[PDB]
Design a protein that fits this description.
This is part of a larger assembly, with chains A and B.
Chain A lengths: L1 H6 L7 H14 L6 H8 L7 E4 L5 E4 L2 H7 L14 H10 L6 H5 L2 E2 L10 H10 L10 E2 L7 H10 L13 H5 L4 H4 L2
Parallel strand pairs in A: 3-4
Antiparallel strand pairs in A: 1-2
Chain B lengths: L3 H26 L27
The chains are: A mainly alpha, B mainly alpha.
PDB class: contractile protein
Keywords: actin, tropomyosin, troponin, TF, contractile protein
Entry title: Structure of cardiac native thin filament at pCa=5.8 having upper troponin in Ca2+ bound state and lower troponin in Ca2+ free state
Chain lengths: 187, 56
């Protein structure tokens, strides 16, 4: 996004500028369920632009840059990565599991982490897998408001489970073994 | 001339209908394993609110 905003006349190269672009992205960007058609109009008219107030009183608007940024999730080649996107990797993780597993993973595609908060991501990912998946199978995405905070929440859940109280390394075992103990006791 | 073939027919029908009978006995005394079950469902009819647990 910083490089494409530079293309539009908004060059952000220092730390304050970088932190600001991240904030702009979080509030203005979306994935688009059809990149090329969305771009055809975003690149042609101000009607698909959204404004943002910069901290110094200046303003910026974002056009196709608004969706081209998250598009890298579907097209990693945008940043120089040799990859077909997060939906191909999701597809392969389902496909590479045993044949009696595949049906359950297709129906339980879980979005987690941040960036899951770009509008349309929960739906585009179901579309992209459905397009690769066999027919008959149900493809479904799980995308709760507990998105981006799901790892922390999982930590809270796990730390407090009765089924997890035997998984903790105590500060006894730790000193006898040293920190390498984590590879035997945790994961 | 009429009694001997009659007796032979009685013996043959006895053996065949009797194997039929001993197996039909097992069929009739127990017709429970050939039944079925209701298989009810809970279905979680509460799509108006959520749960208390930390995982929810």
């Amino acid at each position: 996004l910083m490089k494409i905003l530079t293309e539009r006349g908004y060059s952000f190269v220092t730390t304050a500028e970088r932190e600001i672009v991240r904030d702009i992205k979080e509030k203005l960007c979306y994935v688009a369920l059809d990149f090329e058609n969305e771009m055809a109009t975003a690149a042609s008219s101000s009607s698909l632009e959204k404004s943002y107030e910069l901290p110094d009183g200046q303003v910026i608007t974002i056009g196709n840059e608004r969706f081209r940024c998250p598009e890298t999730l579907f097209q990693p080649s945008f940043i120089g990565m040799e990859s077909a996107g997060i939906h191909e990797t999701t597809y392969n993780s389902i496909m590479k599991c045993d044949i009696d597993i595949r049906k359950d993973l297709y129906a339980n595609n879980v979005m987690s982490g941040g960036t899951t908060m770009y509008p349309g991501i929960a739906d585009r990912m179901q579309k992209e897998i459905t397009a690769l998946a066999p027919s008959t199978m149900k493809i479904k995405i799980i995308a709760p408001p507990e998105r981006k905070y799901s790892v922390w929440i999982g930590g809270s859940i796990l730390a407090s489970l009765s089924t997890f109280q035997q998984m903790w390394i105590t500060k006894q075992e730790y000193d006898e073994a040293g920190p390498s103990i984590v590879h035997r006791k945790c994961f | 001339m009429q009694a001997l073939l009659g007796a032979r027919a009685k013996e043959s029908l006895d053996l065949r209908a009797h194997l039929k009978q001993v197996k039909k006995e097992d069929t009739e005394k127990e017709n429970r394993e050939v039944g079925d079950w209701r298989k009810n469902i809970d279905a979680l009819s509460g799509m108006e609110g959520r749960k208390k647990k930390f995982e929810s």
